[PDB]
Amino acid sequence: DSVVDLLSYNVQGSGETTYDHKNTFTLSCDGSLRHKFLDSNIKFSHVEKLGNNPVSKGLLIFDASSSWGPQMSASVHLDSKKKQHLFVKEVKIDGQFRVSSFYAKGTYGLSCQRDPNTGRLNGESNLRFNSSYLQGTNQITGRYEDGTLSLTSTSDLQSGIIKNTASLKYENYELTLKSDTNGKYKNFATSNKMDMTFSKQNALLRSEYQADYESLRFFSLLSGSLNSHGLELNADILGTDKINSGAHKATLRIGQDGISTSATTNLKCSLLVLENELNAELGLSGASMKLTTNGRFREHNAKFSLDGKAALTELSLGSAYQAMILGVDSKNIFNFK
């Protein structure tokens, strides 16, 4: 208490906390701060029925008011009760925020219904957010039924410029996930759809995606299946445009019989075409390698390929190439064992 305003204020708060031996509990926390630039109102009530009827009530009362524009407030309403034997819970949370003109509001709503006799639960979630330059909203539905879960997610991002949806299912001790995301920005028609699967031993990988930018339709395919007996993976990716087309495929098998790799790259550019084939098998009969490459431009042809076998009994590598480039006869052979 002083003649000067800024030197005068109020600061106080009661943090009451008491448990009733009756198996009932109550928590009270009051916050009130009085100052010449800001005015804070804080009050939170928390009470728990620790005897019978396991009810839980939680309420927050908060309001702070700066005397120089900014105004803030948030409310929390926690409601959980055992309706006879149906456990009913509902939560309402809302945080509201402005400064002078900037806006920021996020409202959330959660609903949960459970039947423990049947081991079944119904979870429903609502999310919405708004601001001066940002819009956010998402919904989640969770269905659990006595060991069986069915969860689904739908997300809208910045007014839906990007759309994402995730589907998950876990039944019979085997997991399956599906996940999709798609772009709606500028010239990008990007769309990725991802699914994952799981068995007692096997996990399966399928991944698709298309970029589809301007005139370029680029595609990537990945297929990965695994087991106790090594991996089998194929990566297949295509980049095709108005004229040019990047086409390469790679196949890799990890088997107890040995390793078989097959990476192939074919490129065509108007009057130029390129073809590339490597073929290596790392088996038990000596490593086998086979190569092929014939780059074709206009009429001119270059024809190359190489055979190769490396066995303990014998090593065989025979190289050959021929071409008529600029009409110049050209041929080389290298055979040696």
Side-chain angles (χ1 to χ4, degrees):
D1 174 64
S2 185
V3 302
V4 177
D5 57 353
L6 302 182
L7 189 55
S8 302
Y9 63 78
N10 175 358
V11 169
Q12 56 156 51
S14 182
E16 178 282 332
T17 301
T18 298
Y19 163 62
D20 184 2
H21 49 85
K22 186 259 179 183
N23 299 295
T24 301
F25 151 75
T26 288
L27 162 58
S28 179
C29 301
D30 180 3
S32 178
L33 304 174
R34 314 303 305 288
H35 309 283
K36 310 318 188 191
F37 66 91
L38 163 71
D39 316 299
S40 174
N41 167 18
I42 296 167
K43 175 65 212 302
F44 174 57
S45 172
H46 186 251
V47 177
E48 306 309 321
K49 278 59 62 180
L50 312 183
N52 64 7
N53 281 303
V55 169
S56 296
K57 300 289 94 175
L59 171 61
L60 168 60
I61 302 301
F62 160 54
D63 286 316
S65 166
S66 175
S67 61
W68 307 98
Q71 299 311 301
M72 295 296 172
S73 179
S75 175
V76 178
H77 288 241
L78 302 168
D79 308 314
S80 186
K81 300 179 288 295
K82 171 165 76 73
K83 180 58 181 301
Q84 293 179 356
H85 184 269
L86 272 300
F87 285 102
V88 180
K89 175 186 297 187
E90 295 187 357
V91 173
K92 309 297 174 165
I93 300 168
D94 300 307
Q96 48 174 295
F97 319 110
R98 281 83 64 192
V99 183
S100 190
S101 61
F102 175 72
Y103 178 86
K105 172 63 190 298
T107 184
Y108 179 68
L110 176 56
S111 171
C112 171
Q113 299 313 318
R114 178 179 182 245
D115 178 9
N117 304 107
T118 62
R120 301 184 292 188
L121 191 142
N122 308 349
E124 301 73 7
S125 177
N126 163 19
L127 186 144
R128 190 274 184 285
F129 170 76
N130 176 12
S131 181
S132 302
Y133 299 93
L134 177 54
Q135 302 331 305
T137 291
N138 173 230
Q139 190 283 339
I140 304 298
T141 184
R143 283 315 329 293
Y144 165 89
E145 300 163 288
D146 205 0
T148 80
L149 177 61
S150 311
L151 177 64
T152 308
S153 173
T154 178
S155 196
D156 314 333
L157 315 182
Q158 185 59 82
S159 307
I161 300 297
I162 309 300
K163 310 293 283 179
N164 178 0
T165 44
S167 177
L168 187 145
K169 286 288 285 175
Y170 166 72
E171 287 68 23
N172 290 318
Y173 288 81
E174 309 324 326
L175 178 62
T176 301
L177 166 60
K178 309 176 68 63
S179 298
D180 165 74
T181 298
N182 303 317
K184 331 287 189 302
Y185 187 74
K186 292 293 295 180
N187 320 108
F188 293 102
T190 57
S191 170
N192 172 226
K193 299 159 57 165
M194 187 64 204
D195 49 353
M196 187 66 204
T197 307
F198 295 115
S199 184
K200 54 182 177 181
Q201 182 190 103
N202 175 227
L204 297 172
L205 182 65
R206 190 277 298 162
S207 176
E208 70 80 18
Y209 161 69
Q210 169 45 250
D212 177 18
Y213 175 64
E214 286 196 74
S215 61
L216 170 52
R217 285 84 61 195
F218 172 76
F219 177 60
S220 160
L221 181 61
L222 199 158
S223 56
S225 177
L226 59 85
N227 300 273
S228 53
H229 284 191
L231 161 68
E232 58 282 11
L233 174 61
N234 188 2
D236 300 326
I237 295 165
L238 270 289
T240 179
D241 207 36
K242 34 199 177 293
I243 294 90
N244 304 320
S245 295
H248 157 71
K249 277 73 69 177
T251 302
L252 276 295
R253 167 52 181 147
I254 297 88
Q256 310 310 109
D257 308 332
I259 301 299
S260 310
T261 178
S262 295
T264 307
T265 301
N266 170 225
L267 180 60
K268 309 202 176 182
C269 293
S270 176
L271 300 180
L272 167 58
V273 163
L274 176 56
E275 61 90 24
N276 302 324
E277 307 66 32
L278 71 83
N279 295 316
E281 200 295 324
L282 297 88
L284 314 172
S285 298
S288 162
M289 66 88 73
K290 176 61 178 66
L291 310 179
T292 311
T293 296
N294 307 330
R296 189 284 324 172
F297 185 28
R298 291 186 286 251
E299 181 273 335
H300 279 337
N301 291 319
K303 298 296 299 309
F304 179 70
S305 187
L306 171 59
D307 64 356
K309 172 271 299 172
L312 171 63
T313 61
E314 178 161 312
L315 182 63
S316 181
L317 304 176
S319 179
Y321 168 87
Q322 66 288 25
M324 73 292 291
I325 311 309
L326 301 181
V328 180
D329 182 359
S330 185
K331 190 275 299 178
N332 60 6
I333 304 299
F334 295 99
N335 310 142
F336 41 95
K337 319 292 152 177

